[PDB]
Every structure is written in C-alpha cells, then in structure tokens.
RNA sequence: GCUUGACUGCGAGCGUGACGGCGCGAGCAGGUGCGAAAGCAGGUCAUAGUGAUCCGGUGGUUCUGAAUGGAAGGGCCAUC
RNA sequence: UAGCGGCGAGCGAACGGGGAGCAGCCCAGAGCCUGAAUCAGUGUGUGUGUUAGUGGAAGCGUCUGGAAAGGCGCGCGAUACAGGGUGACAGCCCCGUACACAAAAAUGCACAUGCUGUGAGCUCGAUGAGUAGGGCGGGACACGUGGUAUCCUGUCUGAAUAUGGGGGGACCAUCCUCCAAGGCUAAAUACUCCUGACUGACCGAUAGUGAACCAGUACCGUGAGGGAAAGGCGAAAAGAACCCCGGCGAGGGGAGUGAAAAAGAACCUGAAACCGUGUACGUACAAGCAGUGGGAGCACGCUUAGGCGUGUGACUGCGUACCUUUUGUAUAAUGGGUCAGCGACUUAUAUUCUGUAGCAAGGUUAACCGAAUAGGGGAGCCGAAGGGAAACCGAGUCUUAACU
C-alpha cells in the first residue's frame, strides 16, 4: 500500500486482546506464598481432648479456622505466562500496525537520529515534529538516541527486533525508520 | 501429573474407528462342554461396549 | 490480592439495622436478630398487601350493610338490586357515599328497591 | 485502539463457578454436592471403574490379544505424502528425511489415501493394489 | 426299524436384561441321518440342573518369536 | 507406551531422538633417553575485583494554606524523571541517581616469570582370582520367581585368563559387540545458615515470620517441650509556666502551646456490641415470635393554608424466630449470649467436553539457544484410515473352506 497484509488488514480486536493480555501476564513475577496449616510454626499437639470439655473439637493450633492458623489454600509461587501461538502473535502485530496506520499514529521517517547523547537535542527534535509520547523504532540500536531518550518518560527508543504489542498500543504515536519498516515487514511477512 | 491408564481395562478394550470400544465376550473361558455350540459360537466374535458402560470404559482409558 | 471485608460487611449490616429501626430490644440493635426481624417484616408486608384488599372490602360491605338496613334493605338484596338496575358503583364508593352523602345512598337504595320490586 | 479500549470476543470469557457464596448464586450452602454421602465429602468419591462392589466391567470381561512389536515399527504412507519427499524417490530414508515417518520405522506401506499426480519411484516399500494403480496411473514405478 | 442333526461355519429378524449376559430364530454354505417322496433333524413337551474374571493345565495352530535362525514365553481356536 | 501387578489397588521403563555441557588419563614395569609434558606447592611482578571513599546538573514569582513540594505563571538540567527525605504531591531544597574517579594496607581471581618437588617421549612388554560362573537364602533392577536375562552378596563352592573371557532378557547355535575382578578425573546438576543489590497484579498489625514492639521473651511444664499478647501524639515536644478545687493525691477546670488538645501522652481515624444523660411520644384492666396491614391522638417542622412530612403509636385484622436435619419441626430435635475481625470448592499437572480466537489437511512446537514475552529450535505430539489377537491386508478388513 509496504505489504498490505501487514499494514492494511482488518483490526481483529479479539486476537489483539488475547495477545495484549498474554503480554501483561508474561510480565507477572508471581512471587509470593502464604503458609498452609503444615507450614505455620507450632506443635501438632491436639489443643484439648476430643470430648468432655464443652468446647468445639480442635485438632491443630494451625487450623485455618483459628487466628494465627494456616491459610486454607495458601498461595505458592506461580508462573502466569500464557502460550501465544506464533501465528496469533504475528497476526496481532499486523492488526495493531494496520490500526496505527488507519488511526494516523504510525509516522515513517527515512532517518531518525541525534548528534550527541543529549536529552535536550531529542526533546527539541520531538517538539519540532509535534511529538511528546512516542515509540521510536530504528533499524539498529544507536547509543546516542538511546541515551538521549532514557530520561524522557513519554519517549521509548527500540530496534525493529524489540517491538511488542503493548508498546505499539501504549504510546500515542509510533515513529518508524524506513529501515525499521523493512525489518518489521520481513519479521511478519 | 499425567492420568494413569487402568491397565486391566487396556487389556480388555480396544477403541474402534468411531470411538466405540470392542471387547471379548464373557463365558468362553471354561465350563464349555455343557454350553451349546450355538451359544459358544455367538460368544466368539468381539462385541461393542454398550451405552450404559462407555462412561466407565472411557474413564479407565483416557489415552485410548 | 488479600481482600479485607470490614467496609463492605459494615455497609451490609448497617443497611439491615436501618430497616430494623423502631423494633424492640435486640431486633433494632443486633444484626442476627434484626436480620430475621427485617425478613419477617417483609414476609408480612407481602402477605398484607393481599390482606389489605380483603380487609377494606370487608369494611365497605359492613358499612353498606348498616346504611342499607337504615334504608330498610339487607346488603345482599341491595347489591342484587343495584346489579339488576345495572349500577356498577363499587363497594368503596358505596361505603363512602353511605357515610358522606346519606341522601344519595337513599337514592341508590330506592333505585335498588325499584329493580327488585 | 488503546489499552482501555480492548475487549475479549463475546462468549470467550465465561465466569467460573464460585460455590458456597449464598442463596442468590444458586450454588450456596451445599455447593451443588447435594446432601451427605461419600460424594458430598472433601476428597470423596469412588475410583474409576468402581461399580459399588459388583465385579466391574473391566474385570468381568476377559483379557484378549497381545501387542505386536512389529506394528510399532510399521507405518502407512498416504499418496499425498509421495510428493512431500525430495527428489521423487520414495524410500524409507527419504520419507524419514521429509518427516513423514519416524526415525525408528523399519517398514512402510503406501495406501490409497489422498491422491498422487507426479511420477514417483517407490523403492523398498509395500504398496496396496489401489496405491500401485494410482502411482502407475501418474507415471510412477513401484520398485520392490 | 434304521441311525448320530446331541453336526461345523454363519445368521435376516426378534425377545429379555442397567450392564455382564441370557433366549427364540427362518434362511445361507459345507457335510450327514431317516424317509418312496413332500419333508424332518443344529439334542430331549417347554420352563430349574448353575459360576464372571484372574491364574494355570492339556491338545491344535510357525499368528508372534527382544541381533539373526530356532526355542522359551505370549496370542488365537478347542477344552479342563 | 512396553511391561510389572491378590494382572487388584497401583507400579512403570528402555531403545531411539532433541538439547545443556563436554576431556580424558594413570598404575598393575622395566629398559632407553633424561628430567623435557602437565598439574600441584611456595615466591616476585602484573593487571583486575573486593574490603573505606571523591566529585556529581538545574527554580523562581504568585495563590490557597499552619506549612507548599499543590494550583497558576514563566524558566532551567537531564547519559541524572531509580529511590528516599523535607511542615500537603519536588527532575532543579536535601540525600542520592546517570556518569566519571579513588586505596596506605589486606586479600579473591586471571595471567607472566623464578625456585622446590612432579616426571613427558619412545621401544619392549604386561593386562586386576577366592575373582567370573555355580548351588542355597535374600536384596536390587519398572520387572512381585515368573519362561526371567542382568546386577549385589550372607552361606557353600569355584574357572578360563586373549589360542581367552563378558554381553546381546529363559536356552542353544551363528554373528555382532565389548574386555570385569585396580584407580583418578573439570563442565553441564543440587542446595542457601549467611553477604550485597534489585524485583513483586505478595502481606499491611486477628494479616505478614511465632516475633513490625528488648520474642523464642513473658508465661506454662520435672523435663523433652510448649509458647503469647503488645505498632501509630504532633510538622516540630512547642509534652501543657502559672492559677484554682483536691489528701503537698487521683482526677478535673482554667491559662498557655499548636493548624487541631473532642491531637494531652489511657494520645491518628475512632465503627459495633454494651452503658448512660436529655428531649418527643407511648405505657400501670393488660395476655403470646413483638412484626405487619389498618389507625386515632400528641409533639415538632413545612411552599395549596393547606395538607404534607418526621417522631411516637392508643385501638384493631392477620401473625408460633432463624439455621440444620428430616416423611414431617413453633417444636419440648440441632446450633448460636452479643458485636467486631478472621473462617470453607483452591492450586499444579494431565485428560475430555463447551465457548472463543488463530491457522487449516494440516495444526503446534518441548527442552534449549536467544539480554531478547521477539526470533530461532518441528525432537516430538495430535490429525488426515481402517480392519484384525497377530502376521498382515488396506477403503477396506476380519470372520469362514467360502460367504447369500
Ligand atoms: K525513555
Ligand atoms: K452438582
Ligand atoms: K444343511
Ligand atoms: K508554588
Ligand atoms: K524528591
Ligand atoms: K561366588
Ligand atoms: K564374543
Ligand atoms: K507459634
Ligand atoms: K502471633
Ligand atoms: K397489631
Ligand atoms: K431425626
Ligand atoms: K436433645
Ligand atoms: K479442562
Ligand atoms: K478450543
Ligand atoms: K464387510
Ligand atoms: Mg498467619
Ligand atoms: Mg517461541
Ligand atoms: Mg480358552
Ligand atoms: Mg491489601
Ligand atoms: Mg442503635
Ligand atoms: Mg438450587
Ligand atoms: Mg449438611
Ligand atoms: Mg441421605
Ligand atoms: Mg449424594
Ligand atoms: Mg479430609
Ligand atoms: Mg519427526
Ligand atoms: Mg423324550
Ligand atoms: Mg422336561
Ligand atoms: Mg496373578
Ligand atoms: Mg530371536
Ligand atoms: Mg536374544
Ligand atoms: Mg547533586
Ligand atoms: Mg497532612
Ligand atoms: Mg582386565
Ligand atoms: Mg556377569
Ligand atoms: Mg556370584
Ligand atoms: Mg545365574
Ligand atoms: Mg531376589
Ligand atoms: Mg547371556
Ligand atoms: Mg502477628
Ligand atoms: Mg488497626
Ligand atoms: Mg494535676
Ligand atoms: Mg475530633
Ligand atoms: Mg502512652
Ligand atoms: Mg497525620
Ligand atoms: Mg483517638
Ligand atoms: Mg375487667
Ligand atoms: Mg390503661
Ligand atoms: Mg405478658
Ligand atoms: Mg393473633
Ligand atoms: Mg424422625
Ligand atoms: Mg408448623
Ligand atoms: Mg414436639
Ligand atoms: Mg429449639
Ligand atoms: Mg420453649
Ligand atoms: Mg445432632
Ligand atoms: Mg446452645
Ligand atoms: Mg491402523
């Protein structure tokens, strides 16, 4: 239109939703636990005899019914990562990239560079382009543009290899070098 | 972990093309002299598991 | 994701206790008792929306009967007479007329008497 | 298209049952387990095939047959697979290279399943009467 | 009187069972008896006379046979 | 899966394949040539870490306020907008952070180079015996003695030793393959009492450690051992000079501090049960789940000047709590003194069905590689063919000598 199958396909919301959700699920650390009744510190002594005392029968001081007792279904560390089918991932990226074009959020440039590793230069470059919140996608990792962008929270600088579906949706605009477009097309076919 | 096959069921039932199970008939191991030839002849071919029993067989044979 | 119940639990208990205002003793103070009291109040109110219609009709009939007998006719004959006269005035209105406009009630009785005789 | 304007497909995300959360839910109190008995209990319920003590079906029926070791190393090739090998010679090795059969398959048979439309040499494999006709119809040779 | 149909392989269809099963069955193939022949015979007027599976035994059958040829063991059929 | 298995419950391989990581050696002995190879040990250097540190950008005005970091206005730094603190929320106030530097002394590591052991290389050899194997008893092998190979050995025995021996799942032959009865050996692997940094759809004081607090304490127990409760004034103590009642009390009232003391130390918020004081209405001729439907009166408010609303509720119809368990409960069956807080269908993996999404006669990868949620990796798995116990045949196949 670049490839039409990549940059001019219909927005499959359900597919994009699954891949975005999976991405966020992949970010989860899942590091936690509680103590079951097995793991709470204490004796296995029956707190009082089964019969005759007039109290509800007790077995463990660690019972989850009890204050200070175990958690009934104590959490363990979990892996929250989902499988995303390769084709569903690539399908979602094509839908996202195509929507960015339809919404006028993908800007393509022949080159995007700054001279020195200086945040002031990039800030001035961006405000000349009517940009503020922007994913900049370059063909390669450039030191100076990366270092310039690091302290700008609204700005992220990637290579073509490190695109992800959340970032394409998250940033208001997406600047792509012409070289990055070639690589992203090559990626997605 | 993986479900374990009930190994005794795997020795008694074979899954057919449309997902039924064939089995060998009971009553043809011994005490054969008193049984009519007709009765024994009808017990020789394999038979299909009935509808009432398929649930029990399927439970026992998750990897059939 | 531990959820503490306090704020929601409080809100629910308060909602019930607000509905139990005016009730005696534990019924206006204590959630366990107030909850039963509020449920029962609702059961009775449901029942008594039906009973109210029964009780008011019963009251109207009693008053029509009194007013009819002042005018020399039973309730049962009066109603039969009005039906034969093709008067469709209902018991609520008849009972109200019986109290507030005794001359119009007398005219209804006279109409009813004419229909039977 | 924002992170707060993406929805799942309708019907794709059904809410899980939560038992024992009050009358309204329809799963309050007993949690769909009914009243009492082994099946109401935590960890309760009989093993697979158990029929209450009646000799179960998988024990009142006789065992039959044996398992063949040869069948595990025997495969069936479809006619559709004949054009997936490289070079147009269908041997045991060329099928293995094309990932049609597993590496430990020693015996393979071409059956009349799918279709063939190229001259293929089949070598060292059994071929069904129908497969042989189909291979030969498309100009192929069955070398034994 | 003469005989071995108390046959072997099957079986349209049906009955009766939760199921395992159990029952009735014309007809088809092979081979048989009795009858001049039509025919009849797959036990007995019928309905009881029974015991799943496992394990193992015996006979048959190269179906299988852990390098290969065998064998063992297993399978299948008959039977205990 | 193959198998094992009162062939029950269950137990459960290997071959082969894909990966991580890879590394080979020595003695059973002399001779020749010599100490040459390679790791050890103990020094000197050499870098490079560690054990203190150093520098480290840029903001003001005005508004609200007790206080400004907030609002508003206009600036500035950013390889630093990690984070923390500061009288409310600070890139620019402070401590940091990015980044760039630093060691007198000790010491980890990687090398370079002495010294002392160490012996490389070549030819000639040699080639682990109470052992292998066996009988008996056990045990181990996924394998329960089974047709049971193989391993270990308590007991009794007992070879051949390279022209020999072991194994190839009873056993034999053939063939193939390996060389026991001597030993050493890095990496990939396991773990965290402990140290540093960093992270969390982990907890937030009945939670999270038993322990946020002088807690393994108090306390209990002869002892082993058991084992708590208990966090928050304020920005700052400015923690209330002084006066008054009181016992030179407790406690309080003023005063003063403070934005606030109804933040006063029994201190943030300050629920509920529970207990009071005040006011309105009702209530001392009246029988019961205490409400509900009807309803007068009284009090207090309000916009037809009217009714209306709020509280109360004389009188009157109806009316035996809830849960549980049951054929059935007001039941004199069960449970609950009340409140508050906590307290029960989860998690992992496998499997099937449904929905939904992708791709479609294909679908999908696992470990792993990759800083890479990418990309690679198709080893596998499921499916597109079944029938038969099986050989085997195959849109058929099995059955049977053969099928109507
Ligand atoms: K940035
Ligand atoms: K249920
Ligand atoms: K015949
Ligand atoms: K300001
Ligand atoms: K700050
Ligand atoms: K021995
Ligand atoms: K040999
Ligand atoms: K404890
Ligand atoms: K505690
Ligand atoms: K009443
Ligand atoms: K009872
Ligand atoms: K009792
Ligand atoms: K499932
Ligand atoms: K699905
Ligand atoms: K057929
Ligand atoms: Mg706890
Ligand atoms: Mg991948
Ligand atoms: Mg038999
Ligand atoms: Mg929380
Ligand atoms: Mg109250
Ligand atoms: Mg229900
Ligand atoms: Mg119950
Ligand atoms: Mg019951
Ligand atoms: Mg039940
Ligand atoms: Mg239990
Ligand atoms: Mg393959
Ligand atoms: Mg007879
Ligand atoms: Mg008889
Ligand atoms: Mg047995
Ligand atoms: Mg063999
Ligand atoms: Mg062998
Ligand atoms: Mg600074
Ligand atoms: Mg404040
Ligand atoms: Mg040796
Ligand atoms: Mg040996
Ligand atoms: Mg031995
Ligand atoms: Mg032996
Ligand atoms: Mg043993
Ligand atoms: Mg051997
Ligand atoms: Mg605690
Ligand atoms: Mg608290
Ligand atoms: Mg004082
Ligand atoms: Mg206050
Ligand atoms: Mg204090
Ligand atoms: Mg505060
Ligand atoms: Mg307070
Ligand atoms: Mg009286
Ligand atoms: Mg009175
Ligand atoms: Mg009384
Ligand atoms: Mg009553
Ligand atoms: Mg009873
Ligand atoms: Mg009753
Ligand atoms: Mg009773
Ligand atoms: Mg009771
Ligand atoms: Mg009582
Ligand atoms: Mg009871
Ligand atoms: Mg009680
Ligand atoms: Mg097949």
PDB file of N, CA, C and O in Angstrom, chain B residues 21-63:
ATOM      1  N   UNK B  21     -15.714 -49.029  21.723  1.00  0.00           N
ATOM      2  CA  UNK B  21     -14.732 -49.976  22.228  1.00  0.00           C
ATOM      3  C   UNK B  21     -15.214 -51.388  21.939  1.00  0.00           C
ATOM      4  O   UNK B  21     -16.376 -51.690  22.203  1.00  0.00           O
ATOM      5  N   UNK B  22     -14.329 -52.215  21.367  1.00  0.00           N
ATOM      6  CA  UNK B  22     -14.603 -53.632  21.202  1.00  0.00           C
ATOM      7  C   UNK B  22     -14.074 -54.357  22.435  1.00  0.00           C
ATOM      8  O   UNK B  22     -13.066 -53.948  23.004  1.00  0.00           O
ATOM      9  N   UNK B  23     -14.759 -55.437  22.817  1.00  0.00           N
ATOM     10  CA  UNK B  23     -14.312 -56.305  23.886  1.00  0.00           C
ATOM     11  C   UNK B  23     -14.610 -57.748  23.497  1.00  0.00           C
ATOM     12  O   UNK B  23     -15.443 -58.008  22.636  1.00  0.00           O
ATOM     13  N   UNK B  24     -13.942 -58.671  24.192  1.00  0.00           N
ATOM     14  CA  UNK B  24     -14.214 -60.088  24.058  1.00  0.00           C
ATOM     15  C   UNK B  24     -15.380 -60.429  24.979  1.00  0.00           C
ATOM     16  O   UNK B  24     -15.496 -59.856  26.065  1.00  0.00           O
ATOM     17  N   UNK B  25     -16.225 -61.373  24.552  1.00  0.00           N
ATOM     18  CA  UNK B  25     -17.362 -61.788  25.356  1.00  0.00           C
ATOM     19  C   UNK B  25     -16.925 -62.595  26.575  1.00  0.00           C
ATOM     20  O   UNK B  25     -15.977 -63.370  26.501  1.00  0.00           O
ATOM     21  N   UNK B  26     -17.672 -62.432  27.672  1.00  0.00           N
ATOM     22  CA  UNK B  26     -17.565 -63.308  28.828  1.00  0.00           C
ATOM     23  C   UNK B  26     -18.166 -64.680  28.506  1.00  0.00           C
ATOM     24  O   UNK B  26     -18.885 -64.818  27.520  1.00  0.00           O
ATOM     25  N   UNK B  27     -17.842 -65.680  29.343  1.00  0.00           N
ATOM     26  CA  UNK B  27     -18.441 -67.013  29.382  1.00  0.00           C
ATOM     27  C   UNK B  27     -17.782 -68.005  28.416  1.00  0.00           C
ATOM     28  O   UNK B  27     -18.321 -69.098  28.245  1.00  0.00           O
ATOM     29  N   UNK B  28     -16.594 -67.702  27.860  1.00  0.00           N
ATOM     30  CA  UNK B  28     -15.928 -68.626  26.946  1.00  0.00           C
ATOM     31  C   UNK B  28     -14.505 -68.948  27.408  1.00  0.00           C
ATOM     32  O   UNK B  28     -13.623 -69.171  26.579  1.00  0.00           O
ATOM     33  N   UNK B  29     -14.289 -69.029  28.729  1.00  0.00           N
ATOM     34  CA  UNK B  29     -13.006 -69.440  29.285  1.00  0.00           C
ATOM     35  C   UNK B  29     -13.024 -70.926  29.620  1.00  0.00           C
ATOM     36  O   UNK B  29     -12.077 -71.635  29.290  1.00  0.00           O
ATOM     37  N   UNK B  30     -14.072 -71.380  30.318  1.00  0.00           N
ATOM     38  CA  UNK B  30     -14.135 -72.756  30.787  1.00  0.00           C
ATOM     39  C   UNK B  30     -15.590 -73.152  31.027  1.00  0.00           C
ATOM     40  O   UNK B  30     -16.494 -72.362  30.760  1.00  0.00           O
ATOM     41  N   UNK B  31     -15.794 -74.382  31.526  1.00  0.00           N
ATOM     42  CA  UNK B  31     -17.120 -74.958  31.702  1.00  0.00           C
ATOM     43  C   UNK B  31     -17.829 -74.920  30.344  1.00  0.00           C
ATOM     44  O   UNK B  31     -18.927 -74.388  30.221  1.00  0.00           O
ATOM     45  N   UNK B  32     -17.154 -75.452  29.314  1.00  0.00           N
ATOM     46  CA  UNK B  32     -17.570 -75.292  27.926  1.00  0.00           C
ATOM     47  C   UNK B  32     -18.406 -76.470  27.424  1.00  0.00           C
ATOM     48  O   UNK B  32     -19.252 -76.260  26.555  1.00  0.00           O
ATOM     49  N   UNK B  33     -18.188 -77.680  27.956  1.00  0.00           N
ATOM     50  CA  UNK B  33     -18.875 -78.886  27.499  1.00  0.00           C
ATOM     51  C   UNK B  33     -20.392 -78.751  27.618  1.00  0.00           C
ATOM     52  O   UNK B  33     -21.098 -79.149  26.699  1.00  0.00           O
ATOM     53  N   UNK B  34     -20.880 -78.190  28.737  1.00  0.00           N
ATOM     54  CA  UNK B  34     -22.309 -78.036  28.973  1.00  0.00           C
ATOM     55  C   UNK B  34     -22.935 -76.960  28.084  1.00  0.00           C
ATOM     56  O   UNK B  34     -24.153 -76.951  27.939  1.00  0.00           O
ATOM     57  N   UNK B  35     -22.131 -76.020  27.560  1.00  0.00           N
ATOM     58  CA  UNK B  35     -22.648 -74.926  26.754  1.00  0.00           C
ATOM     59  C   UNK B  35     -22.906 -75.423  25.336  1.00  0.00           C
ATOM     60  O   UNK B  35     -22.105 -76.183  24.793  1.00  0.00           O
ATOM     61  N   UNK B  36     -24.029 -74.977  24.756  1.00  0.00           N
ATOM     62  CA  UNK B  36     -24.385 -75.294  23.383  1.00  0.00           C
ATOM     63  C   UNK B  36     -23.360 -74.683  22.431  1.00  0.00           C
ATOM     64  O   UNK B  36     -22.835 -73.603  22.704  1.00  0.00           O
ATOM     65  N   UNK B  37     -23.106 -75.363  21.303  1.00  0.00           N
ATOM     66  CA  UNK B  37     -22.208 -74.848  20.283  1.00  0.00           C
ATOM     67  C   UNK B  37     -22.693 -73.496  19.771  1.00  0.00           C
ATOM     68  O   UNK B  37     -21.867 -72.621  19.526  1.00  0.00           O
ATOM     69  N   UNK B  38     -24.014 -73.342  19.601  1.00  0.00           N
ATOM     70  CA  UNK B  38     -24.606 -72.092  19.148  1.00  0.00           C
ATOM     71  C   UNK B  38     -24.250 -70.961  20.111  1.00  0.00           C
ATOM     72  O   UNK B  38     -23.856 -69.880  19.675  1.00  0.00           O
ATOM     73  N   UNK B  39     -24.418 -71.212  21.414  1.00  0.00           N
ATOM     74  CA  UNK B  39     -24.124 -70.208  22.422  1.00  0.00           C
ATOM     75  C   UNK B  39     -22.654 -69.796  22.341  1.00  0.00           C
ATOM     76  O   UNK B  39     -22.367 -68.604  22.308  1.00  0.00           O
ATOM     77  N   UNK B  40     -21.751 -70.782  22.288  1.00  0.00           N
ATOM     78  CA  UNK B  40     -20.318 -70.524  22.244  1.00  0.00           C
ATOM     79  C   UNK B  40     -19.914 -69.822  20.952  1.00  0.00           C
ATOM     80  O   UNK B  40     -19.063 -68.937  20.989  1.00  0.00           O
ATOM     81  N   UNK B  41     -20.530 -70.216  19.829  1.00  0.00           N
ATOM     82  CA  UNK B  41     -20.249 -69.620  18.532  1.00  0.00           C
ATOM     83  C   UNK B  41     -20.585 -68.128  18.535  1.00  0.00           C
ATOM     84  O   UNK B  41     -19.824 -67.338  17.982  1.00  0.00           O
ATOM     85  N   UNK B  42     -21.713 -67.752  19.152  1.00  0.00           N
ATOM     86  CA  UNK B  42     -22.110 -66.355  19.259  1.00  0.00           C
ATOM     87  C   UNK B  42     -21.223 -65.558  20.218  1.00  0.00           C
ATOM     88  O   UNK B  42     -21.149 -64.340  20.080  1.00  0.00           O
ATOM     89  N   UNK B  43     -20.556 -66.225  21.170  1.00  0.00           N
ATOM     90  CA  UNK B  43     -19.624 -65.567  22.077  1.00  0.00           C
ATOM     91  C   UNK B  43     -18.227 -65.370  21.475  1.00  0.00           C
ATOM     92  O   UNK B  43     -17.427 -64.664  22.085  1.00  0.00           O
ATOM     93  N   UNK B  44     -17.899 -65.985  20.326  1.00  0.00           N
ATOM     94  CA  UNK B  44     -16.551 -65.899  19.777  1.00  0.00           C
ATOM     95  C   UNK B  44     -16.220 -64.503  19.239  1.00  0.00           C
ATOM     96  O   UNK B  44     -15.160 -63.983  19.578  1.00  0.00           O
ATOM     97  N   UNK B  45     -17.045 -63.876  18.362  1.00  0.00           N
ATOM     98  CA  UNK B  45     -16.719 -62.558  17.813  1.00  0.00           C
ATOM     99  C   UNK B  45     -16.674 -61.491  18.905  1.00  0.00           C
ATOM    100  O   UNK B  45     -17.392 -61.598  19.896  1.00  0.00           O
ATOM    101  N   UNK B  46     -15.855 -60.455  18.692  1.00  0.00           N
ATOM    102  CA  UNK B  46     -15.785 -59.329  19.606  1.00  0.00           C
ATOM    103  C   UNK B  46     -17.082 -58.531  19.507  1.00  0.00           C
ATOM    104  O   UNK B  46     -17.694 -58.486  18.441  1.00  0.00           O
ATOM    105  N   UNK B  47     -17.490 -57.917  20.622  1.00  0.00           N
ATOM    106  CA  UNK B  47     -18.692 -57.101  20.680  1.00  0.00           C
ATOM    107  C   UNK B  47     -18.325 -55.693  21.124  1.00  0.00           C
ATOM    108  O   UNK B  47     -17.253 -55.481  21.684  1.00  0.00           O
ATOM    109  N   UNK B  48     -19.255 -54.763  20.898  1.00  0.00           N
ATOM    110  CA  UNK B  48     -19.082 -53.372  21.265  1.00  0.00           C
ATOM    111  C   UNK B  48     -19.540 -53.188  22.708  1.00  0.00           C
ATOM    112  O   UNK B  48     -20.449 -53.883  23.158  1.00  0.00           O
ATOM    113  N   UNK B  49     -18.895 -52.255  23.418  1.00  0.00           N
ATOM    114  CA  UNK B  49     -19.334 -51.846  24.742  1.00  0.00           C
ATOM    115  C   UNK B  49     -20.661 -51.101  24.584  1.00  0.00           C
ATOM    116  O   UNK B  49     -20.792 -50.271  23.688  1.00  0.00           O
ATOM    117  N   UNK B  50     -21.627 -51.399  25.469  1.00  0.00           N
ATOM    118  CA  UNK B  50     -22.945 -50.777  25.451  1.00  0.00           C
ATOM    119  C   UNK B  50     -22.873 -49.330  25.946  1.00  0.00           C
ATOM    120  O   UNK B  50     -21.894 -48.942  26.581  1.00  0.00           O
ATOM    121  N   UNK B  51     -23.944 -48.562  25.684  1.00  0.00           N
ATOM    122  CA  UNK B  51     -24.019 -47.139  26.001  1.00  0.00           C
ATOM    123  C   UNK B  51     -23.886 -46.896  27.505  1.00  0.00           C
ATOM    124  O   UNK B  51     -23.190 -45.965  27.907  1.00  0.00           O
ATOM    125  N   UNK B  52     -24.569 -47.721  28.315  1.00  0.00           N
ATOM    126  CA  UNK B  52     -24.507 -47.641  29.769  1.00  0.00           C
ATOM    127  C   UNK B  52     -23.086 -47.710  30.331  1.00  0.00           C
ATOM    128  O   UNK B  52     -22.797 -47.071  31.341  1.00  0.00           O
ATOM    129  N   UNK B  53     -22.204 -48.449  29.644  1.00  0.00           N
ATOM    130  CA  UNK B  53     -20.875 -48.774  30.132  1.00  0.00           C
ATOM    131  C   UNK B  53     -19.767 -47.898  29.546  1.00  0.00           C
ATOM    132  O   UNK B  53     -18.673 -47.907  30.101  1.00  0.00           O
ATOM    133  N   UNK B  54     -20.019 -47.176  28.442  1.00  0.00           N
ATOM    134  CA  UNK B  54     -18.978 -46.402  27.770  1.00  0.00           C
ATOM    135  C   UNK B  54     -18.339 -45.375  28.703  1.00  0.00           C
ATOM    136  O   UNK B  54     -17.131 -45.172  28.625  1.00  0.00           O
ATOM    137  N   UNK B  55     -19.142 -44.729  29.563  1.00  0.00           N
ATOM    138  CA  UNK B  55     -18.629 -43.795  30.555  1.00  0.00           C
ATOM    139  C   UNK B  55     -17.575 -44.420  31.472  1.00  0.00           C
ATOM    140  O   UNK B  55     -16.555 -43.795  31.756  1.00  0.00           O
ATOM    141  N   UNK B  56     -17.833 -45.658  31.913  1.00  0.00           N
ATOM    142  CA  UNK B  56     -16.927 -46.388  32.787  1.00  0.00           C
ATOM    143  C   UNK B  56     -15.637 -46.733  32.040  1.00  0.00           C
ATOM    144  O   UNK B  56     -14.553 -46.574  32.602  1.00  0.00           O
ATOM    145  N   UNK B  57     -15.757 -47.181  30.777  1.00  0.00           N
ATOM    146  CA  UNK B  57     -14.606 -47.575  29.975  1.00  0.00           C
ATOM    147  C   UNK B  57     -13.753 -46.350  29.644  1.00  0.00           C
ATOM    148  O   UNK B  57     -12.530 -46.425  29.749  1.00  0.00           O
ATOM    149  N   UNK B  58     -14.395 -45.248  29.229  1.00  0.00           N
ATOM    150  CA  UNK B  58     -13.690 -44.036  28.835  1.00  0.00           C
ATOM    151  C   UNK B  58     -12.878 -43.493  30.013  1.00  0.00           C
ATOM    152  O   UNK B  58     -11.737 -43.079  29.815  1.00  0.00           O
ATOM    153  N   UNK B  59     -13.478 -43.480  31.213  1.00  0.00           N
ATOM    154  CA  UNK B  59     -12.798 -43.075  32.438  1.00  0.00           C
ATOM    155  C   UNK B  59     -11.513 -43.881  32.633  1.00  0.00           C
ATOM    156  O   UNK B  59     -10.460 -43.300  32.880  1.00  0.00           O
ATOM    157  N   UNK B  60     -11.603 -45.205  32.459  1.00  0.00           N
ATOM    158  CA  UNK B  60     -10.476 -46.106  32.645  1.00  0.00           C
ATOM    159  C   UNK B  60      -9.400 -45.965  31.563  1.00  0.00           C
ATOM    160  O   UNK B  60      -8.249 -46.314  31.822  1.00  0.00           O
ATOM    161  N   UNK B  61      -9.759 -45.490  30.360  1.00  0.00           N
ATOM    162  CA  UNK B  61      -8.855 -45.467  29.217  1.00  0.00           C
ATOM    163  C   UNK B  61      -8.769 -44.059  28.634  1.00  0.00           C
ATOM    164  O   UNK B  61      -9.207 -43.819  27.510  1.00  0.00           O
ATOM    165  N   UNK B  62      -8.165 -43.086  29.358  1.00  0.00           N
ATOM    166  CA  UNK B  62      -8.058 -41.713  28.857  1.00  0.00           C
ATOM    167  C   UNK B  62      -7.154 -41.535  27.635  1.00  0.00           C
ATOM    168  O   UNK B  62      -7.334 -40.574  26.896  1.00  0.00           O
ATOM    169  N   UNK B  63      -6.205 -42.465  27.425  1.00  0.00           N
ATOM    170  CA  UNK B  63      -5.279 -42.429  26.298  1.00  0.00           C
ATOM    171  C   UNK B  63      -5.610 -43.476  25.230  1.00  0.00           C
ATOM    172  O   UNK B  63      -4.734 -43.819  24.435  1.00  0.00           O
TER     173      UNK B  63
END
